[PDB]
Structure formats: structure tokens, C-alpha cells
Point group: C2
Chain length 51, copies 2
């Protein structure tokens, strides 16, 4: 519903900006990149004994 409202009330090239914002920015952030940074600190290993 939110996508439909923005898409119709937009210009021609502004629809190219909309599709590059959704299938590229939102999609890869949600389905691909989010689990890449899952263990960023859990698998951060330091060669030390200092607590």
C-alpha cells in the first residue's frame, strides 16, 4: 500500500529512483547484508589476555 501510493504520485525518472531505492538498497540490506554483520563482535578475536 505504501509502495503503491508513492509510485503512482511520482514523475517518470522518479520511478527509476524509486525502483533503485527498493530492490537495491532495502532488499540487499534486509535479506543479504543484515546476517553478514550478525557476529561482528562475537567473532572479533584479539590476541591478548587482558580483560
Amino acid at each position: 500500500t505504501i509502495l503503491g501510493g508513492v509510485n503512482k504520485h511520482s514523475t517518470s525518472i522518479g520511478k527509476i529512483w524509486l525502483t533503485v531505492l527498493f530492490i537495491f538498497r532495502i532488499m540487499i540490506l534486509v535479506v543479504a547484508a543484515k546476517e553478514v554483520w550478525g557476529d561482528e563482535q562475537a567473532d572479533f578475536v584479539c590476541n591478548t589476555l587482558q580483560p
Copy 2:
């Protein structure tokens, strides 16, 4: 002389005395409790 035998031999026995009955046990754990803040084998 007086210093040639009495003082020289006594100081020599003193140095041996310190080394065996006192000093040897002080160094017995030199590497066992050498502690390094590291994880590197």
C-alpha cells in the same frame, strides 16, 4: 697474611653458603612463574 687466608677463605665460604642453602631455592621457579600477558604460543 691475615687477610690472605682468614678473610679470603671466609668470604669464599660465605659466597658458597649463600648460593646453596639460601639462593638456589629463590631461583627454582624462575620460568615456572614467568608470566606474559599474551595468547601467542
